[PDB]
Enzyme design. Structure first.
Site, PDB file in Angstrom:
ATOM      1  N   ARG D  96      65.546 -23.114  55.722  1.00  0.00           N
ATOM      2  CA  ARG D  96      64.653 -23.254  56.874  1.00  0.00           C
ATOM      3  C   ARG D  96      64.984 -22.245  57.967  1.00  0.00           C
ATOM      4  NH1 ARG D  96      63.494 -25.692  53.153  1.00  0.00           N
ATOM      5  NH2 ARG D  96      62.012 -27.430  52.966  1.00  0.00           N
ATOM      6  N   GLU D  99      63.438 -19.108  56.907  1.00  0.00           N
ATOM      7  CA  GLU D  99      61.996 -19.164  57.110  1.00  0.00           C
ATOM      8  C   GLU D  99      61.632 -18.915  58.565  1.00  0.00           C
ATOM      9  OE1 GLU D  99      59.213 -21.696  54.832  1.00  0.00           O
ATOM     10  OE2 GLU D  99      59.060 -22.760  56.762  1.00  0.00           O
ATOM     11  N   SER D 122      72.870  -9.164  70.674  1.00  0.00           N
ATOM     12  CA  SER D 122      74.102  -9.071  69.900  1.00  0.00           C
ATOM     13  C   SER D 122      74.326 -10.305  69.035  1.00  0.00           C
ATOM     14  CB  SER D 122      75.291  -8.900  70.853  1.00  0.00           C
ATOM     15  OG  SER D 122      76.513  -8.714  70.151  1.00  0.00           O
TER      16      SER D 122
END
EC number: 4.2.1.104
Lengths: 156, 156, 156, 156, 156, 156, 156, 156, 156, 156
Positions: D96, D99, D122
């Site tokens: 997830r 995604e 960063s």
């Protein structure tokens, strides 16, 4: 039908054009498939380049979508199948069905061999459908049915 | 359960050991899961490294398969899921379920958005089962039911 | 909205045209989203092919960017999501968020299972935002908040 | 610390051993990190092979987990970082977060450049934390905060 | 500058056009950068799609190469960086720099951690230059200097 | 030396053992290479499987690290070079040097051909070194020097 | 020549045009290279995008093939080399030379180190020739000569 | 010989053991092949897992290298050929031969079809050899001769 | 025929045009090959970009399909062979032949070495044909005959 | 047989042991299959991990090869099929069958759809055999017959 395709991009470019016409006309896949005598999953797959329409259904959906004659002919050709851009879907909606295979793929194999024996569940002698049902706890669920013939693997 | 795994090979090595013991004892997945109160697809997935068994179920299947204590503990751990060796199955039985996604993946997407709207069918709030039915034409068929909650995508 | 896309290139090509118009008009994403009632992250994602705009917002941003009627319609379609060219970003700015997964991915898994249990943090019942804050040591920091619902994985 | 690793498998094998000890002792990551003076995300990442513990913290977690001296030393080594087995996670919980990049990666880039300018957020001057909160609609949510310094890209 | 790109092909196509104009005009990259106040490596990288030029520099190089106004604008946009076609270069000249990573990559890691500690040498707070020197043994050498800030990885 | 390796895992396993002995003895790479007559980058690379030590240096570092006879022999063999696990580094410290290639690879090609002509900068007639210096604006920087012979590509 | 390319498709598109003109004119590569003063393998490689022609040879083959002025200039540019579409050839004729590496690659390494020492056989200080000879058992053979400078790898 | 292998790792592990024994005995590949009546390239390739030795040669080299009987048998087995770890070599010495394919692969195809016609140069009816020659300009060169039968592709 | 191609897209684009003309004219591959004196599998492969037609056959099929002169010439060129889009077919019909290799590939190797010896079955001195026959249980079967010369591997 | 495998390495490791025993005993695959009533292609495939033997045949071949009882049981398990190490064979003998798909894959598709219609030639209702025949021009040929049932793809 004896004519077939070897480059999926021809039918997939047609699919994009179909989808734009479909959106402009405010049409659903259920109403496009209505009157063809064919299941919405089969007709939709054909529009999206993954099945071949018989000539009568091709002329019917082509009229609904204002397709030219080349495109009505193309919908009747046997496709070069494969809808995933690059093997693993990026789209979340399609990806969940791939994840189902990452979690349950070996369970599907194990239970197929237990209930049927060595061999496969066919992806060819095969139909699927999608149904919406209410969830008793709230909301809605999709019940997706995969229905394939068992083909045995036997010694020879 | 708050303990989880990060290297799938530990639970997959255990699965290989389970499968050998299961074969020596002439056991089926249906009878291993019998008495657990849990669906055969869920128990089978746990044996194969893809789910976590509650403690009572782990001890029950551990007794049937003569597993040691570390193995019974491992079955209760939350797994690092992913049963496919290298993204795309080589095994024909498993491959057919990947091929259904190559043929129908975009149709599943299109019909999900048509019937439910933007969003996904969950692979988490999700149940799977495999049923054997007679083919009216002769032979046998597998009816595989994927039952997932619709989760909508809306603006924010 | 029941209309959806199957080929990301259509909306990604539109995104390139949108970015060119946006640059020519010296517009920011914050000001394009102004007046829509929708968060900048959501509207920006839609312009970039990863969300669907409601009709009123699509018409609004389309007027701002001088988009044609087909483009305003395309912005309302449910996309084929996936913004990364080839799975792993090459762009340094995007790559840093992938690197956070390479360093902390298993820690995210471990702490999610510890605090919530088996299951997932949803990427669908989900929102994201980006905030700029002063660094006490000098300079600026981005605070990027990922906010997703816990969906449990339960036996069945 | 000037000692570093070049093969991630050494520390990842240690992580599996740590996880087994942790499960046998019914310990949480919050409990293990308590008393180290360090954030649970940092200590957890070090146990999982992705950070280096200072000597005092290594000795403390080693006592808590009954680790041998070679292991306590290894936890202090600068790691060969990279927790994902093969670039893209298979595990749903980890996936997830990948995604989220496929959906919002270009939005994050766009909004970083709008709010900060050319450059990066960063992944090194960087902190992450996972917070469990109530979902006001019912249930629980994870608020994951990615807090990184903006490093500008400027001509030279 | 707050405008940014998401599809590298736009700036890479511009780069090809720039290179043709440069060849017809018999121009060097040193000549093109002359008068900008910017290092030849930075200006060259911008022409090749990997940096953004400030407005004054974009107008100057644009006049030298007879670029149209859209192209001068494009040179000012923040790029989607990544110059390698498919991850590993095929070109021998570029490949040698990848080979130096295959031979010395772990040595660079080890010596960086030895001299500086945990963390990275930045690729953002970073400058590069290429110098031609005589080889005392006959021939010529390139001295390529990579100059990056050390950013520490510290506990939190 | 006429003996060479064909499987990098042999020398990489030795590197892991070397790193453990080095950590227990609190040794630096600079002090291991002291007395050897060879640059720290060359000796370090040999320990890490990427160069061959001459017999005298192999005996010296082997005594410092308490290596057995087979290990001291292995350090003298010509290696199967390639230190990256799978083509693209996962480790942030190593990855930054790959990113420098993704950003500047085509600029390096262009400036090499401009200053020298067609051909390559050798990765074989080649030295590198890593220097720690002050950042004039606060902090520390690494100056990494790549020093390779120009080899021309000429017609034949 | 100081001008170089960064996108192989420009010269590979030109190669396709050259091949069409050559077929229409019933010309061989030997005929085209005749009078250039250059080896057929070198001139052929330049036509196919993998070498740069000197100005006189570019004008000459340009006359033979009726090329336009932009094409004659492109043939003089230093190429972005790499003729294989996707790393491993699909074409049988081309694949056999890759298979030679799969079978004899480690033997070539072993014998180079035995005869020469550590280092490489150059692909830059390098000539290639294809000779047709009779097969004394009937038929024909190709004798392909790879002639490269030995470059030593020495300590520093 | 009718026995064959299916897993290259068996013969490649043997090759590693052979290389160790060879190193301990200070033997060259030329020395090992002496007395077999077979070319050094063929014998070396067999030791490295890529050819099958006849029984007499296997017994000869096995005595020289002090191999057990299982290993002398393994050397006579028809191998599962393929010496490259993962398709593209990382080692510089082997990579240069891959690079000659990237530069000259299409030239080899073109000149083969010109001199012989449609079809291939065989990698089976095939031999190679490596010769050291003096460079008139100083140093040494390798002349590697690839010698394969032309097999035509004919209509049927 | 001494003219050859290096970019498969030219002949594959022509194949697409051939397939459209063929479909509009309701022609079969058997009819197109009729009168050429050539096997239907050879002529079909040529149309699809994988073989070269002799001039008389190219003109005959060109007349039947109403191809222009550039297309009739292209069919006579030696192709850059390789019909699979990306190494592994997505199309079910094509995929089954790849699956036969995943199941029986090592069996084919083993039985070829048993019946013939070391070496290969040629894909060049090679014919295939496809025969439709009755299935003795009901239905139809394809008998596909692969007929290749045995080429031995022997010492040299 | 209801027992099945999920990790190919178990049966592939057994295959290696079988092949060593077979070599020591100087046995052919034809000899091993003699007395089973099963085809050499089927028994060989089972030994190599790609089919399941019935108990009587497993007991027979296990006696011939001196297999232990765990191995005789393993040969009866339904396998996780897939004999190719990494998708594309490296071995020349196996590679030629893959090349036949690269050259004729689209021709096989085209002729299957022409002769049978939409659908597949089954890889499950499927038999294979290898026959040696004399080549009238000298030498020997292999005739490999692939025999599969046509399964139609029909609308629903």
């Amino acid at each position: 039908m004896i004519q077939s395709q070897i480059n999926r991009n021809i039918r997939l470019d047609l699919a994009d054009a179909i989808l734009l016409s479909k959106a402009k006309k405010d049409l659903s896949f259920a109403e496009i498939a209505d009157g063809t005598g064919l299941a919405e999953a089969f007709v939709t797959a054909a529009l999206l380049g993954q099945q071949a329409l018989p000539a009568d259904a091709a002329r019917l959906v082509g009229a609904k979508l204002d397709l030219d004659e080349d495109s009505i002919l193309l919908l009747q050709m046997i496709p070069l199948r494969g809808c995933i851009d690059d093997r693993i879907p990026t789209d979340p909606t399609m990806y969940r069905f791939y994840e189902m295979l990452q979690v349950y793929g070996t369970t599907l194999k194990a239970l197929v061999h237990e209930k049927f024996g060595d061999g496969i569940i066919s992806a060819i002698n095969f139909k699927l459908d999608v149904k919406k049902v209410a969830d008793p706890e709230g909301g809605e669920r999709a019940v997706i049915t995969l229905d394939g013939k068992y083909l045995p693997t036997k010694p020879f």
